[PDB]
Amino acid sequence: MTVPDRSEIAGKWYVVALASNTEFFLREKDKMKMAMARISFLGEDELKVSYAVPKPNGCRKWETTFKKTSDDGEVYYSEEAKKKVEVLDTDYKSYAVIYATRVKDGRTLHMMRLYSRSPEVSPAATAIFRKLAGERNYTDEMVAMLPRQEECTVDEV
Numbered sequence: 001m002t003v004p005d006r007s008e009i010a011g012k013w014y015v016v017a018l019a020s021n022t023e024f025f026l027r028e029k030d031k032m033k034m035a036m037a038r039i040s041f042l043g044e045d046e047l048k049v050s051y052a053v054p055k056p057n058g059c060r061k062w063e064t065t066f067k068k069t070s071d072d073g074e075v076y077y078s079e080e081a082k083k084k085v086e087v088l089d090t091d092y093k094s095y096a097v098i099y100a101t102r103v104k105d106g107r108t109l110h111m112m113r114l115y116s117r118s119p120e121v122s123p124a125a126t127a128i129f130r131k132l133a134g135e136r137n138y139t140d141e142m143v144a145m146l147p148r149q150e151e152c153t154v155d156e157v
């Protein structure tokens, strides 16, 4: 158990960037703090993810299971949850940017996010995430960033 095998392909990721299509999310997220994300391979076609966010009520965490969906190569779709995530770009030794979308009966929501190899936002990741954001005619309130405001973190093992 807990062998150093596939585990190398999984771990924890710190989301130091955020983007929301709905004003409310932007308003709420812009006022909150950086979030967490840890993913674990449930199966060959199934995957599990643990979320950690600092909520006024305390560190709010949650773990959800998704299904493999190699849309744009290592993308994931959670039909049961109505949430899709697609890794846009990621550095083996640097920052990474992943795109996410969720659709509800009659409504489509998109949420862009950026994660750092550790709980620390980098200028490079910032400029990169923004460069793409600007290419889509994004607006400041549409994006959300968290500076050296870290404190609550999610465990890995």
Ligand SMILES: O=C(N[C@H]1COC(=O)[C@@H](NC(=O)c2cccc(O)c2O)COC(=O)[C@@H](NC(=O)c2cccc(O)c2O)COC1=O)c1cccc(O)c1O
Pocket (backbone or CB within 6 Å): 015, 035, 036, 037, 051, 053, 062, 064, 081, 083, 100, 101, 102, 109, 110, 111, 113
């Ligand atoms: O519409 C979406 N959320 C709702 C509904 O989802 C939820 O309320 C919870 N959520 C999941 O259970 C979830 C289970 C499985 C998958 C999830 O993503 C869940 O979040 C908790 O998330 C939160 O409280 C907040 N959330 C993050 O800060 C976030 C930060 C980093 C990473 C996150 O995922 C976050 O949600 C706000 O989220 C919401 O209001 C939604 C859309 C697009 C992309 C999303 O991520 C959404 O969740």
Ligand SMILES: [Ga+3]
Pocket (backbone or CB within 6 Å): none
């Ligand atoms: Ga979510």
